[PDB]
Amino acid sequence: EVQLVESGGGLVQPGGSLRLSCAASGFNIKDTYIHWVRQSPGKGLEWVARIYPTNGYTRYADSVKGRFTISADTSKNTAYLQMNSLRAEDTAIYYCSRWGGDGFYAMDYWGQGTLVTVSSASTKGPSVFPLAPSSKSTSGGTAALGCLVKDYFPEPVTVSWNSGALTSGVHTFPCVLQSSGLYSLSSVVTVPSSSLGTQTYICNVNHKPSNTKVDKKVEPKSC
Amino acid sequence: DIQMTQSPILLSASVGDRVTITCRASQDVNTAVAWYQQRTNGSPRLLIYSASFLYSGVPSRFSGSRSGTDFTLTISSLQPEDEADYYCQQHYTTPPTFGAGTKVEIKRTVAAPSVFIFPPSDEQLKSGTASVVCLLNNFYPREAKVQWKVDNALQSGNSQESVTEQDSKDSTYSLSSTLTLSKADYEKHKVYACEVTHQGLSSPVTKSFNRGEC
Amino acid sequence: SEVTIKVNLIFADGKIQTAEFKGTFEEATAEAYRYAALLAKVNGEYTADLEDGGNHMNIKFAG
């Protein structure tokens, strides 16, 4: 299977530098173009740069020329984006993609994308509070419970339930930027009322920018 | 540069319908236009390349066509899982450029929300902030009004909402509203009420608790 | 300034779709009529009723 995997995105101060990698497998980047494409509210999907690793030819968007360089190491089947003199408008999800693979004249494979946050604020790990199921979160024989993941920066966090074995009825909400400048999100799951107390329910929270990994058990509050 | 102009910005249709979205190139791009689908938390996925050709694995209900500089994407029998953002892209001149996107939403029958409320956790109350969470589960359409009342006084400026994207199976939404107080304020008042107005409800639903009750 | 023109797409068989066009009032208007004419190719001649100073449109297709 063809696969591209970006890494290296994170929080970087204005004026600072960051280097992203794009690791390819299931094909050889010598046979295709490799592109970097970013996505942001300001510009939507926005082409950044491309390279033809067979001969080293590169091209850049005007807004990044001189501040970004693309390159590839065919020995490691990997492409790179060096990002210097970073600005607020560089904050974006950075994807890499291939073009021309198997003769397809389009971007037929993309990575999952790596997030770059250009900001002067500093990293902060979330507090993870349970949303305990109760008489006020149940009806029709089902009950809602969850986890509040409060006061983190930067994005992203990930939330799973019972190590990913619980997916049905899960709603993990989009984060909200609080006026403090810190993010917050909640994740809820709906389950049979009769399972409360016999089935263990744990939200697995990971905030990699602060090395924060939390497994919070959510149970009915006793009185 | 070549700009790609997509319309409409939002299109909402029933399951089984035929939907058409369009993309206009500011100058001749020949057939060098691709269409991508982007679903929640995913990267763009190639649907159509060179204006009219189905990428491998893509369902045959997707089709594309070209007339001069006008490019259309058609979904002949809309499925719930086609809920997504769609983007066209030209590769005829560098820089390759993308349209601004068309969002496709599924129309379905009205469903009133399940309304739940969560006091601040005892853990959170240990430090100095209180978060009260109101949950509207699995409703349609998206429009809803959540109002917070604290001891019957309408709250304003101290709540934030978040809405999930349309469910890929039942096409419903869920919504959370979070009211944020100081702990001192939270311990000062008694009745915490979330009031939900929604088309599926015969009249607004209030869900509430008294601070300190079990 | 930016406005949203809301449009009901009313097809001959009774099926209804809704769509939004955004931009300046003049851009959003032109896009709506352009889109109406495109769908008319396969759905039959259209007619467009305008409510609310033109910020909302009902567009029926003849089939």
């Binding site: 996505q39 999907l45 989009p174 993010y183 | 910005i9 995913g42 601004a100 969002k103 809405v163 994207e165 | -």
Partner: peptide, 12 residues
């Protein structure tokens, strides 16, 4: 309508 970082979708 523009892309939203938190929803990872075009807003509406």
């Amino acid at each position: 309508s523009q892309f939203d970082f938190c929803t990872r979708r075009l807003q509406s």
